[PDB]
Design a binder for these strands. Structure first.
Length: 183
DNA sequence: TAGGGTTAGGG
């Protein structure tokens, strides 16, 4: 049994009329659901327009994710790896991005190093090992862009990532402005 | 479109 957090998906953009039942009836087509709930206002019962579905295994999570686009109750919804409550506190933790910030990589890190670890998560479109402007000095971090945002989500939910023989920190990339706005 | 009475004691 893998962790509950890794077996759960956030389902955004739910129709006003989606219920635990209708939601379950839809996502169960890809596996056994161990939890399925629609979040609604605790005071007015009004649906908050999002919910969660949890499968018995992450493989079933991947199957469902490979079944995108998902249309539930006539509304195109948006399934997403569930970000823990703790990580949801982080800036931009819920953004739909294709690029990840990879920090703490050795100076001699080369593109193949990044590929031997990240390709497993999805198609890589761009790899950028950052260096200093005019200096040429390696700055110790890189950006990797994938063709699917879920490849990023699958990555950022994991705690450790080994590149060029050592652990590195991987986060969703924030723009120059988002960074400055979260600072 | 980010969580369901789900987050720092008392020795």
């Amino acid at each position: 049994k893998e962790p509950e957090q890794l077996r759960k998906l956030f389902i955004g953009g739910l129709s006003f009329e989606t219920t635990d039942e209708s939601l379950r009836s839809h996502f169960e087509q890809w596996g056994t659901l161990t939890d399925c709930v629609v979040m609604r206002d605790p005071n007015t019962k009004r649906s908050r327009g999002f919910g969660f579905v949890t499968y018995a295994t992450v493989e079933e999570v991947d199957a469902a994710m490979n079944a995108r686009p998902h249309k539930v109750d006539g509304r195109v919804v948006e399934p997403k790896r569930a970000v823990s409550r703790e990580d949801s506190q982080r800036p931009g933790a819920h953004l739909t991005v294709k690029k990840i910030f990879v920090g703490g990589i050795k100076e001699d890190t080369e593109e193949h190093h990044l590929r031997d670890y990240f390709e497993q998560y999805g198609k890589i479109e761009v790899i950028e090992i950052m260096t200093d402007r005019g200096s040429g000095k390696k700055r110790g971090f890189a950006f990797v862009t994938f063709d699917d945002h879920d490849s990023v989500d699958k990555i950022v939910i994991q705690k450790y990532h080994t590149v060029n023989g050592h652990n590195c920190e991987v986060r969703k990339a924030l723009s120059k402005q988002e960074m400055a706005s979260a600072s």
